[PDB]
Design a protein around this nucleic acid. Structure first.
Lengths: 114, 149
RNA sequence: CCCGGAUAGCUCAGUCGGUAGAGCAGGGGAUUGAAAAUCCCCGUGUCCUUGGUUCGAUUCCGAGUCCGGGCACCA
RNA sequence: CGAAGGCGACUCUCUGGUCUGUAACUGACGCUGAGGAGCGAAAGCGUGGGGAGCGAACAGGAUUAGAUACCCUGGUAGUCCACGCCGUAAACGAUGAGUGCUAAGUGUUAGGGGGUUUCCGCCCCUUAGUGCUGCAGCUAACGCAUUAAGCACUCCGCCUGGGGAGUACGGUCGCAAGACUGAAACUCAAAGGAAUUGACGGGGGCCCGCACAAGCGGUGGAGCAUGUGGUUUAAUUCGAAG
RNA sequence: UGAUAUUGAAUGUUGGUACAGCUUGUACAGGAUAGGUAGGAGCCUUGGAAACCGGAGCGCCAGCUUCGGUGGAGGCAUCGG
C-alpha cells in the first residue's frame, strides 16, 4: 500500500504505537512490552525509540510512505517518535497533540495520599 | 575539592613505553618493583618467542579486546536498583584493562605468573579468553541498562 | 473401541533429512546505608526404548508402558 | 450576586432583591429583636424512579514482624431526580445587626458629573461593594487599620480555670440515627494565648571531613600472644562500660 | 437439540473430491541449492542466446525461481572437481 496514519499513545506506563490506514484500519503496531521492556522501563524515551522502529518495519512490509502522527496522552515518547520515524525514512506530515480533553466529564479518582 | 591528578614515571628499559610501567605498578604486592619486574621481562621474552612477533604489537592489541566502552553507575530509588550508562574516559580504558588483566592472570593457575600472564595476553590477543568476557558481560550489563542515560 | 501427557533439576515448547530452545530453579555477578522483587552470565538434556528407510536421521516409520476424556461390551 | 448555606453549558417562561440618577411624593413611617416562624452544603433516613464514571462496607493481590491502613484491580450503599424528614459542620472574616465620625495611597466591578474631544482616550470630582501597603489611636504580641480589632451609642446572644462532658438525668422534637436546653459528685494547681532563644525534622537552600563513591590492605574463619567479659575457686585486688 | 425435509428461488462463502492447471527437492564438501529410480552424451537458440531492467515469490536471506521489457548470437550437459 501507499498511505496511512500513525497513532501514538504515550501514557505514564506505555508507549503504544499503531500504524493504521488514513480511514482507520490497522497495519502494524508495537510497544515496550512488545519488545521486552518488562518493568517500569516502558515510559523511557529509549523504549519509544525502539518500539516505533519495529512497527515501522511492518510499514516497509506494506510499502506505505506517508504518515500523519497523532500524539495522545502525557508521557515522554512524543519526541521519540519524531526522532525515530523521521529517521525511519517515512514521511511525517502532520503532528497533532490530540489528547481527549474532557470538558468536565466524570469525576477523577482520589489523590494518592488521602 | 575539585579535580586532583597524580604523577607517573615515563620510561621503560625494554618496550620503551609509558603504559607498561603502569603495569609494573600493577602486581606490586607489598612494595616490590623488581620482584614484579622479574616476572615481567621473563614473560615477554616468552611472548616474543612462543608467538613469533614483537611483544608490543601483541600487548596493546590484546588490550583492545579488554578496554571497555561503557561503565555502569547506579541509582537507588526505594529499592528499584537503577543503573546509569557511563562513558568510559580515555583515562579509564588504560586503568581498568590492567585490573582485568592481572586479577584474572594470577587467578588462572599454572606454574609461575611468567606463564600465567603470557598465555593470558594470547587469550586476549586471540580474544578467546576468560578475562575478555569480563569486558563482554559489562556490555551485556550495558545493553540491558541502555534505556536510561 | 478412539482421543489426550513421555527432555534441561523442574515446568514446557518445538522443524518438510543434518541442532539442543524459553520460563522457574541452581551457581555467581553487579546493583543497593541492608532486604526481597527485579537486571545479566554460563549452566545441565540418548528430546523414552528398540529395530528400519537412509549419508547419519528428537526429526520417522516397524514394536510397546502409564496418567485423563468418552462410545460401548460385562455371563 | 444572595442574608447565610450556596449558584458556573445554552435558551425560553415565572420571580426576588441590589445600585445609580434626581425630587415628584410621604412627613420619622425607623433600628434591633427573647420566645415563635422559614431557609440551611455533605452525610444519613422513608417511598418509588435512574444508576456511565466515581465509590464507604466487604473481597482479592501486595506492603509489612502485624496491615482490620496509605498503594493496587474490582466492588454494595451512595451521589442523581421528584416528594417528605433530620436541622448539624473550621454553617470562618474563627470578627452578632444598624447609625455617624476619624490621614492617605492604590487597584479593581457597576454607575454618574465635568474637562478639550463624535471620538478613542486621558485628567478630575463623585456613590457602591471589592483587595493590597500604610498615620493617629487600639492591641498582651502577631496583627487590625473609612470593609476596624479607632473613639461613642442604642438594642440580642455568649463566657467566668482545665478535666469529668456536651456526658448522665429530666423534658420537648424526630420514622430512626441523634439534634436542642443542660448538670453533679469527683480531681489536678494548672490545662491554653502570642512571642524569643535554642535543639530537633523520614522539611528546604548553601557548604564540609577518607564520611561516601572510585581503589588498596586487613579485622570476623585458623593457631597463638594479649585485654575485659562471664564462669570459677581460699581469693581470682580495685577502677574504667556506646 | 439435530437429521429427514412437507420445501424452492437466488446470491455469495469456505472444506471435500470428480477434474485439472501449476510450485517446491544444499548437511557440508561444493562452481554451487545434491530427493530417488530408469534413459543417457546431449540439448539449445533469427521459431531469439550472453548481458541489462521490471514484476510475482521463495530463501538453510546466500541466492534461487518464473514472467515481462531490452539485446544480439550466444548458452548449457556428460566429462572434470
Amino acid at each position: 500500500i501507499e498511505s496511512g496514519i500513525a497513532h501514538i499513545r504515550s501514557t505514564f506506563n506505555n508507549t503504544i504505537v499503531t500504524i493504521t490506514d488514513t480511514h482507520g484500519n490497522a497495519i502494524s503496531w508495537s510497544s515496550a512490552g512488545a519488545l521486552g521492556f518488562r518493568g517500569s522501563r516502558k515510559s523511557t524515551p529509549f523504549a519509544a525509540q525502539m518500539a516505533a522502529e519495529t512497527a515501522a518495519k511492518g510499514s516497509i512490509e506494506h510499502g506505505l510512505k506517508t504518515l500523519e502522527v497523532t500524539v495522545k496522552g502525557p508521557g515522554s515518547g512524543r519526541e521519540a517518535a519524531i526522532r525515530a520515524l523521521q529517521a525511519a525514512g517515512l514521511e511525517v506530515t502532520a503532528i497533532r497533540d490530540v489528547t481527549p480533553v474532557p470538558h468536565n466529564g466524570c469525576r477523577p479518582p482520589k489523590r494518592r495520599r488521602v | 575539592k575539585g579535580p586532583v591528578a597524580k604523577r607517573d614515571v615515563l620510561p621503560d628499559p625494554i618496550y620503551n613505553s609509558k603504559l607498561v610501567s603502569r603495569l609494573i605498578n600493577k602486581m606490586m604486592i607489598d612494595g616490590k618493583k623488581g620482584k614484579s619486574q622479574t616476572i615481567l621481562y621473563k614473560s615477554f621474552d616468552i611472548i616474543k618467542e612462543r608467538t613469533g612477533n614483537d611483544a608490543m604489537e601483541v600487548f596493546e592489541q590484546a588490550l583492545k579486546n579488554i578496554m571497555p566502552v561503557l561503565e555502569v553507575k547506579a541509582r537507588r530509588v526505594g529499592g528499584a536498583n537503577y543503573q546509569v550508562p557511563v562513558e568510559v574516559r580515555p583515562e579509564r580504558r588504560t586503568t581498568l584493562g590492567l585490573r582485568w588483566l592481572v586479577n584474572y592472570a594470577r587467578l588462572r593457575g599454572e606454574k609461575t605468573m611468567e606463564e600465567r600472564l603470557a598465555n593470558e595476553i594470547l587469550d586476549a590477543a586471540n580474544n578467546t579468553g576468560a578475562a575478555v568476557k569480563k569486558r563482554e558481560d559489562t556490555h551485556k550489563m550495558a545493553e540491558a541498562n541502555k534505556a536510561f542515560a
